[model samples]
Target: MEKENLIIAGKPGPEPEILANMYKLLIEENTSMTATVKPNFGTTSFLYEALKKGDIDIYPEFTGTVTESLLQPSPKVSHEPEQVYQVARDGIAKQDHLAYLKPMSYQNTYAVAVPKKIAQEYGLKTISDLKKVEGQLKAGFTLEFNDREDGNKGLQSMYGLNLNVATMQPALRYQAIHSGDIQITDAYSTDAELERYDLQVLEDDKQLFPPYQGAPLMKEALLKKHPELERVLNTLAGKITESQMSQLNYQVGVEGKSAKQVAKEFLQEQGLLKK
Candidate 1:
């Protein structure tokens, strides 16, 4: 492949390694790419806005989050996954032409997970079920969740949850949850703690948590100017499931593997490296 222009943009988190690896592959393949990163901004809001505004040429994001957040469909992820994507696609059609490629099939959601043993004993297998143990739990979270549609507000409204929420930085939230300072905490579904601490993600019977599936969104003008980029990028479709994300996050966050090493292995394992 010859040189072509690209600007890979995204925020950093447990998943930043993946974004970097994806961009590394793009650059190494001589796609004439330059990477742009905005640290601490989440994929759903910051990256989406940049893509839509033509401020960024490329960024990774999830289907459910985009459908719920960017599209602002009334129903949210309350509808099925395919329905959510359809709604998002339709909504974007009405906008300044932000295009969402095929989804990665994995769905990450906000969750209240507890230690595995605690989860089993309390029969705390569902979001609604958490209410029963609210008295015993001090929950922790990233403060942003308080304002987001997919955060505590949604869970409280939908599940009638009453657990105490201590807003903390993301790294601190994990310690709080692990130390039993908070028996349960708000967690990104794809976070590695589920594996590291043997925490269990209760099911959301009410589906309050919107799905957050990762994919690339490109500006309309950029896509038309470099059509092959779409095919190259969309190759990530139906890959990197929720489980895979958690393990990779855990490996980097808990086991202390370097982000680049973890991402390289992840791409190789997912066969994303071949393309």
Candidate 2:
């Protein structure tokens, strides 16, 4: 039998798995779509460049996927990740014909959390609720957030909210929050520790944050090559809710289930992949 093939460029994590499954589902529906997996292509920015050059085909992306992904010169933007997303899409496509499909509903943007006790004591339920005590709440973050648009400083600048921030290695930021060394920390909504720590995500009362939903960005050539690629992918748009995203992320990031498995399970149960 001739071995089939596919080449994907993605970060060294759950992204590839999800993509593999997406490919598999498309192939199942249209055998011509058969594929193989490629991974660990470095930062998303590098991957975007490669896609433009045709080094790879398709991959998972997020809103404000990374402000730096395309070399934009704007100050770290904190509001409307959708705008940032479109700006990136326009910037990339104008120069190289990059295209992004509708975004999935979940976001990978930064989140705020506090120990269960603290949340209860102050009746703190949202970011606006924390405004009165912003300075009192010591915060910690992955050092990268210190620089990224979605990072600490950009978020502060966007919302005009003042907070006391301390830096920590990414691994330790979660610990700082759980142990009460800090009342709040930068976090991803889908992380296992978010639930494990029982922290609360304050509402972005002023909408300063940008969207980070997982989305599929493609090369115009690849879409024309397969043609129906977007149809298979669009099946996943708003259908992916936050809790489902967290659980799916748990399956890939924590449970060791392959992305294909997680995608299949999700699509089948939801009646999208047509089990």
Name the top TM-score candidate. Answer: 1
Error of 2 at 45 (Å): 2.7
Q: Which pairs, if any, clash in model 1?
A: 61-214, 61-215, 62-213, 62-214, 63-213
RMSD of each: 2.9, 4.1
Tens digit of per-residue lDDT, candidate 2, span 1-275: 54344465565456445655675676557545466556555556667777777777777777665445454664355466567666666765675676777776666766777877888898888876777788678888766567666566656776666778888776578777888899988777777678878888877776656667666777877777766777777777765777777787678877888777787878788887666
Give the RMSD in angstroms, all C-alphas superposed, for model 1: 2.9
For candidate 2, give the lDDT. Answer: 0.69
Runs in model 1 deviating more than 4 A are: 1-5, 27-30, 34-43, 76-79, 269-271
Instruction: Give the alpha-carbon lDDT of every model.
Output: 0.70, 0.69
| lDDT string, candidate 1, 129-237, tens digits | 8888788777887776776666788877777786688888776877777887887877777877777788888887887766566667777777787676777766677
